[PDB]
Ligand SMILES: CCOC(=O)CP(=O)(O)[C@H](CC(C)C)NC(=O)[C@@H](NC(=O)[C@@H](NC(=O)CC(C)C)C(C)C)C(C)C
């Protein structure tokens with residue numbers, strides 16, 4: 001049975017988490033994203049000036065082209081990428097996927113052209129939303145899951161410290177106590193789950209659903225919950241330059257918790273201070289609006305407090321506080 005550990009590392013302010021992946025002999029630094037299902041990489045098919053500052057994949061060296069296949073993806077912050085497809089060997093923490101579909105970028109939007117922290121994305125949402133056309137492909141996880149000791153992966157993302165992605169096994173030393181599991185609705189291809197209630201500092205409210213998404217920096221909630229949270233933070237104000245609600249960095253923030261199948265997942269107010277707003281002397285809050293989409297995004301701010309198991313059997317999600 002195969003299992004492996006890949007180490008992730010946060011970039012500045014934990015804006016994103018990158019982990020090395022070897023593709024056809026070359027190691028690239030990718031952003032592992034449980035919110036999408038495409039494995040796409042910077043490649044030699046991009047303009048030479050955009051390859052600058054990246055580790056790039058060269059398909060001709062080792063990949064097998066899928067003639068006529070293309071991919072095109074667009075994300076929630078408006079960024080996008082597109083290209084063609086090859087199959088190659090992909091290794092993550094010593095687990096190798098032979099014949100994994102690798103999406104070689106031919107075009108990338110400015111957001112990606114500006115980010116030299118990563119060389120592409122490894123999607124870990126359900127393969128049902130993979131964008132490859134005319135026939136969709138399986139994520140790295142779906143490709144290897146029958147070979148793992150257990151068909152699951154787990155994640156510990158940390159604040160300014162290296163974390164891990166465990167594939168095929170659960171590391172009990174990464175959390176306190178026992179895991180609590182909840183059912184996943186994979187109908188829109190996400191690791192979607194329900195919360196029965198929430199408490200934002202001194203205010204509590206009714207439940208909602210959200211997705212566990214390693215690829216999103218913040219915890220994005222309904223405007224109503226955002227308002228209630230910041231109404232308790234002295235002097236909090238929106239700052240379009242910073243990207244949402246900001247406050248004096250020294251402010252004492254209330255905690256935020258959700259009740260999931262009887263387990264209280266709590267994000268301590270210190271994790272809600274994301275960092276310098278990069279606009280004067282204030283800090284950006286880790287809780288911001290989901291722009292009215294109807295469901296919450298449990299991004300890195302939330303994940304930094306938990307050890308999370310993504311189990312294909314059910315499917316289900318297990319939660320426990322990070323040790
Ligand atoms: C399948 C569709 O699902 C999604 O698109 C959500 P994802 O997690 O796949 C995507 C990955 C990102 C790398 C584009 N993340 C996103 O699109 C989210 N983008 C973000 O969280 C961006 N982070 C920031 O802007 C940091 C700033 C908030 C202080 C990226 C640079 C990490 C938006 C939801 C705010």
Ligand SMILES: *[C@H]1O[C@H](CO)[C@@H](O)[C@H](O)[C@@H]1O
Pocket residue numbers: 001002003004149168169
């Ligand atoms: C993950 O689990 C596998 C299967 O037991 C081990 O062989 C591997 O060393 C790692 O513990």
Ligand SMILES: *[C@@H]1OC[C@H](O)[C@@H](O)[C@@H]1O
Pocket residue numbers: 005006007008162164
């Ligand atoms: C990244 O890979 C393997 C180990 O578990 C971890 O300690 C390392 O930093």
